[PDB]
Amino acid sequence: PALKLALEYIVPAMNKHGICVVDDFLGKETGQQIGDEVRALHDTGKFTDGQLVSQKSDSSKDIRGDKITWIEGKEPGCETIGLLMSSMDDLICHCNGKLGSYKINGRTKAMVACYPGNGTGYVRHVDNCNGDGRCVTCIYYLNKDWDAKVSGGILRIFPEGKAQFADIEPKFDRLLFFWSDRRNPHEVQPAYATRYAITVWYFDADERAAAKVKY
């Protein structure tokens, strides 16, 4: 059950550690269909360079070297991505009142992202630096039989205040949650194979409105 999973596993893990990993989130068949839709999107050549909040160079691959496309989930041939988004939204909304002080009332479009090997990555960064309203980062990974010792691409999270870190392999059908603010600096270490993932950011109501009056 999605609700039971959320309250029994995700809420405690988030409030204690600020990171939560759920493996085998949708199962092999559905995850495979999502991988097919993502690869078909990639095959159309539509992906564009990942963007930064404050971008200073047209080409910023040394900061983040991924290529992305934004998906609403209602698009043609994207039905299963839409199912993934509906599942995540159902889960998150069922966490409301239990993710600290956050009351989630919105999300971004889904960011489908591809690091095309060749040592591309994402230097250590924070998703939400300045209170832009993003409170929870959700990432769904699509890469089968991923061997970090050969392909790199580990997501290393450096939880604030301690020498600790969490290494997250971008493993197929893995769903990852973490606080988007400065508590969780993280980096994608250089990848040497094609690396696919889908990210959704969820917004806190009050921080979102405050960010609205501030921008």
Partner: peptide
């Protein structure tokens, strides 16, 4: 500061959820 030089763009759209 330099934090937003490294942060991922959120897109131009927010989709309402939950309530």
């Amino acid at each position: 500061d330099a934090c937003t030089l490294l942060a991922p763009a959120a897109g131009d759209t927010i989709i309402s959820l939950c309530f």
